[PDB]
């Protein structure tokens, strides 16, 4: 059963534990990296690291994808944006008018598939 | 409104984007370190940093909190401990039979709070 609790007090500013995003991709995803982490394989080419501002979080995402992921595009609340990286292969996906939480998934030498963790307002 | 989706196709090994965790603390906690991004500020001790294996997650997870996070302590589904790190004093509350996703807060000089993310089972 999905859930959050808050513990604490008032005070401080706002961060997520999801700081940086940058991907391996070519025509598909080889690999995400997230906070710095490789998840994937070697193959294609690294991309630019987007990290997120202090209160800034990803509202609005495109993800193409068959049994692979095969492109991934989002927007922030701030209105800055990332890719879109990867091919034209797959079906696309998207979320909008999110907050997103958390970005696991699975890979090998690829990425396989990514599991969002998400508020939809 | 909390939720999942997943994207893509059947193979490759899971993987979290939560994949470390340290503190700064005394008799409560100035920082948490995630993935080896810090929120919050420099007094305290720094913790060694727990970096999760694969197919690794907390489970169990104690807070010690008033206004701000006191102390810390978590156990994995693998048997590893953190912890307990900070003071003894504030309220206790304890996540059992869990399995994290995200941990997000709120900080300045100090830890002032904690939104953990997380499947109750």
């Known amino acids: 059963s999905l859930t959050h609790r808050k513990f604490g007090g008032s005070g401080g500013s706002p961060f997520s534990g999801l700081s940086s995003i940058a991907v391996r991709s070519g025509s598909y995803?080889?690999?995400?990296?997230?906070?710095?982490?490789?998840?994937?394989?070697?193959?294609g080419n690294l991309s630019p690291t987007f990290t997120f501002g202090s209160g800034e979080y990803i509202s609005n995402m495109t993800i193409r994808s068959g049994d692979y992921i095969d492109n991934i595009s989002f927007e922030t609340n701030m209105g800055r944006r990332?890719?879109?990286?990867?091919?034209?292969?797959?079906?696309?996906?998207?979320?909008?008018?999110?907050?997103?939480?958390?970005?696991?998934?699975?890979?090998?030498?690829?990425?396989?598939?990514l599991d969002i963790y998400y508020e939809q307002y």
Chains 1, 2 share one sequence.
């Open 29 to 43: 995803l080889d690999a995400i990296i997230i906070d710095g982490v490789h998840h994937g394989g070697s193959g």
């Open 82 to 113: 990332f890719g879109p990286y990867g091919g034209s292969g797959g079906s696309a996906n998207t979320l909008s008018n999110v907050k997103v939480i958390q970005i696991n998934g699975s890979a090998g030498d690829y990425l396989d598939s």
